[PDB]
Design a protein around this ligand. Structure first.
Ligand SMILES: CC(=O)N1CCN([C@@H]2CCC[C@@H](NC(=O)c3cc4c(F)ccc(C)c4[nH]3)C2)CC1
Ligand SMILES: C[S@@+](CC[C@H](N)C(=O)[O-])C[C@H]1O[C@@H](n2cnc3c(N)ncnc32)[C@H](O)[C@@H]1O
Ligand SMILES: [Zn+2]
Ligand SMILES: [Zn+2]
Ligand SMILES: [Zn+2]
Length: 238
């Protein structure tokens, strides 16, 4: 299969014509941050790491950071300042991942390196919709006869749509037996969704998560994850 690194998405011209030669997926607007179609705090208690503790390689805002435990990211005002390891989303500290053609699912994501268990992969970025905007879009995509859908539930009246605008996170595929999960994190009072490994993911391996978004309409998409325990279709029951 053809592959490409995440830096290949930064050059729209070379991208567009790579796409014409089918060596890259179709063009979409690349964004670093969620874009609201309609516009709508305090620090952790981690004891600053001494320069020596930092040298030894001790982790700043690690497993015991009060902010991390609550899936809240520290700000510029964290007592560990620049050394805070709990600003992954804001600092784009994404895993090393490539975009690959799969036999039947379209494009996908794979580890370029071994990925430890419980590792941040990518934020799922896109246009944030309310229910009304969501229902407009479902109808628009249905009428265009789109195959690939990019909806991700954020919360009540907030659905992320990475159809037109998003990042490489939009290439991660469903599996019934996944190696990743979603986590909803608080970043500057705003909620965001990121992919995280659930196990050690060998280099070259396809990255996958259990997509549980509630099915609408009559005909559901067939699942080609190939797990022995495949549910056979994409989306949650209803
Ligand atoms: C053709 C047609 O009209 N259909 C009716 C609508 N259904 C689904 C229902 C559930 C919402 C929507 N799926 C996604 O947005 C979606 C899938 C998916 C995935 F499999 C992996 C990862 C991500 C981020 C994913 N998002 C449309 C598809 C069939
Ligand atoms: C968010 S997109 C994932 C990226 C997509 N493969 C692409 O090339 O743009 C989700 C879509 O990918 C396909 N897909 C994802 N997981 C799949 C699976 N397990 N089996 C079959 N198709 C899958 C479906 O068309 C689905 O609507
Ligand atoms: Zn902390
Ligand atoms: Zn911190
Ligand atoms: Zn499956």
């Amino acid at each position: 299969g053809p592959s490409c690194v995440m830096d290949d998405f930064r050059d729209p011209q070379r991208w567009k014509e790579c796409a014409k030669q089918g060596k890259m997926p179709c063009y979409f607007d690349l964004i670093e941050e969620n874009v609201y179609l309609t516009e709508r705090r305090m620090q952790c208690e981690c004891t600053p790491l001494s320069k020596d503790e930092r040298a030894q390689g001790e982790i700043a805002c690690g497993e015991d950071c009060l902010n991390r435990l609550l899936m809240i990211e520290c700000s510029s005002r964290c007592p560990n300042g620049d050394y805070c390891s709990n600003r992954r989303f804001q600092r784009k500290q994404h895993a090393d991942v490539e975009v690959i053609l799969t036999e039947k699912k379209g494009w996908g994501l794979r580890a370029a390196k071994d990925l430890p268990s419980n590792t941040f992969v990518l934020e799922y970025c896109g246009e944030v919709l309310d229910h009304k905007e969501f229902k407009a879009r479902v109808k628009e995509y249905a009428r265009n006869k789109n195959i690939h859908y990019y909806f991700m539930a954020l919360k009540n009246d907030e659905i992320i749509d990475a159809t037109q605008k998003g990042n490489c996170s939009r290439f991660m595929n469903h599996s019934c037996e996944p190696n990743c999960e979603t986590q909803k994190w608080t970043v500057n009072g705003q909620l965001r969704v990121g992919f995280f490994t659930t196990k050690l993911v060998p280099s070259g391996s396809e990255l996958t998560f259990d997509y549980q978004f509630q099915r609408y309409g009559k005909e559901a998409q067939k699942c080609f994850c190939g797990s022995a325990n495949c549910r056979g279709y994409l989306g949650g029951e209803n």
